[PDB]
Each structure stands twice: as structure tokens, then as C-alpha cells.
Amino acid sequence: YPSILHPIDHAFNEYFLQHQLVEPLNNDIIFNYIPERIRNDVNYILNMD
Amino acid sequence: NLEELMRTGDYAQITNMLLNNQPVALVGALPFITDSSVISLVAKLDATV
Amino acid sequence: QFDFRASMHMLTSNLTFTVYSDLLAFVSADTVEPINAVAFDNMRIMNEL
């Protein structure tokens, strides 16, 4: 999108745009988020429905 | 072994085999529906259970 | 002084996405019957039964 910004305002907004904290989320990430010793425990059945 | 499957509760193998149409034999005391309809057999209903 | 050339920028971002906080809400977790629960050595936790 076009924008009119002072160079300082542009610097701040461009830093916010270029350095966002969001990462892609997939089922592999969620699976690895579970503790690795609970994923390997046979007493717990974990599924991605 | 359906008994082992129910005890452990892990359906990964059975799900993989059913989704991939891999021939298998589910072994365990099971109740069954007796059907005398020829049209049901032609319709291949037994494979939909 | 306001210079249009120096102030006109193109801001680039993503069209849309959804941010999720509770990753573990995506995991369907069940547990075996307590009678059948086993310890790290693959034997039942309580064997006196």
C-alpha cells in the first residue's frame, strides 16, 4: 500500500513490519511443542484431529 | 489384535492400514450383522463398516 | 520542508493470517485405563492388582 510518512515515522513503521513476532504454525510445530517424554509415553494417546 | 488395540488405545497402525486400503484381519470376538439381501452384497455394504 | 518524493513509501505486509495462542488446544489427548498404565520399563505401574 502507498503511505505518506516522515522518515522517522517510516523507520518505525518499517521496523514493525519487517520484524513481526509471528511464525508459521503447523501440526508438526504443535506436536514438537508437546514435551518429548510425554509424546514417547505409551500411557497417553496424542492425536492431531 | 483388537484386544491389544483397545488396551493401548493407539490407532495409528489401524488408521494407516484402513486409509491406505492395505489388506488386514482384525482379530477378536466381534458381533456381526447377518444380512440376507443380495442387493446389499452387490452394493458392497460390508466394506463400509 | 515536506517533500512528497521523500515521504511516499510502499508498506508491505501479509494479506491476512490468524494467530493462535493455545497450541495444546489443537491436541486431542486421551489416556489408557489406569489398570493398564505401564511405567518406563513397559511393566504395569502397580502389579499387585
Residue C36: list chain B partners with CB under 8 A.
Answer: 7-8
Euclidean distance between CA atoms A27 and C23, whole angstroms: 9
- A-chain residue closest to C22, CA distance: A30
* B48 close to C (CB below 8 A): no
Q: Return the H-helix or E-strand segment holding C31.
A: strand C28-31
Interface test with B, best of A41, A47, A48, A49 (most B CBs within 10 A): A47
Question: Does residue C44 sit in helix, strand or coil?
Answer: strand
- ∠ CA C34-C37-C43, nearest 5°, is 145
A25 touches C25 (CB < 8 A)? no
**For chain A, which chains pass the contact test of at least 3 CB pairs under 8 Å?**
B, C
- List beta partners, residue A45: C30
- Number of Cα atoms under 13 Å in the Cβ half of residue B17: 9
Task: Cell numbers for A47, please give them.
Answer: 492425536
List C30's β-bridge partners, or say none: A45
Which candidate from C9, C20, C27 shows the least CB-CB separation from A3?
Answer: C9
Look up residue B45 and give its DSSP letter: G
Residue type, C28: S
- Name the nearest CA neighbour of B20 among B32, B12, B31, B30: B12
CB distance C28–A1 less than 8 Å?
no
Query: Which residues in chain A are contacts of B19 at CB distance < 8 A?
Result: none
Data resolution in angstroms: 2.9
Instruction: Give the pairing of strands C8-10 and C28-31.
Output: unpaired
Phi, psi dihedral angles at C44 (to 5 degrees):
-65, 145
- Residues of chain B with Cβ-Cβ distance to A45 below 8 Å are 8-11
| Residue whose C-alpha is closest to residue C21's, from A3, B4, A21 | A21
Residue found under cell 488395540: B5
10 Å Cβ neighbour count for C39? 12
Closest CA to A43 of B8, B32, B2, B13: B8
Q: Does B4 touch chain A (CB under 8 A)?
A: no
- Helix, strand or coil for residue A25? coil
Experimental determination technique: cryo-EM
Is there a contact between A26 and C36 (Cβ–Cβ < 8 Å)? Answer: no
